[PDB]
Structure 1
Amino acid sequence: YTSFNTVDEWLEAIKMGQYKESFANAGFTSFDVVSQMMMEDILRVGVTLAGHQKKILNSIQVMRAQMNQIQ
């Protein structure tokens, strides 16, 4: 899940490291907030490629659902 003490690691794990710069500079610096990100947020941090938006959004959805189990 959390094999990443950090958001940069996670983005790296899902091969989306190219966005760390974007994510950081937008305040999405923890999994707490990241896991609440919606498509809108993904667009704002500037993710414009359809495949990336998806890969990311879907990872976030797994992240969020998992966090929710361990409330």
Structure 2
Amino acid sequence: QTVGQWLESIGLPQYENHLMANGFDNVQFMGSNVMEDQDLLEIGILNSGHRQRILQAIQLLPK
């Protein structure tokens, strides 16, 4: 689906708008295209735990 449940799945809401704000969409494509810490920062993901979770979140998305 669209970016949301993915964030909710990792239990990290409020990152959807963030992704959108960063023009980030298609978590899959992202998880299959963009994998980096800075990117988490790009979207404004501060909390490293969240960043790590998001990093793991994209990793969770099939390659």
Percent identity, aligned pairs only, is 31
Q: TM-score, normalised by structure 2?
A: 0.80
Question: What runs of 5+ residues in structure 2 fail to find an aligned partner?
Answer: none
Structure number with higher helix proportion: 1
Q: How much is the aligned-residue C-alpha RMSD, in angstroms? A: 1.4
**CA distance change for structure 1 residues 26 and 33 in 2, over 3 Å: closer, same or farther?**
farther
User: d(CA) in 1 for partners of 2:20 and 2:29?
Assistant: 11
Bigger radius of gyration: 1
Q: TM-score, normalised by structure 1?
A: 0.73
Question: What runs of 5+ residues in structure 1 fail to find an aligned partner?
Answer: none
The structure, 1 or 2, with the larger RCO (C-alpha pairs under 8 Å, 6+ apart) is 2
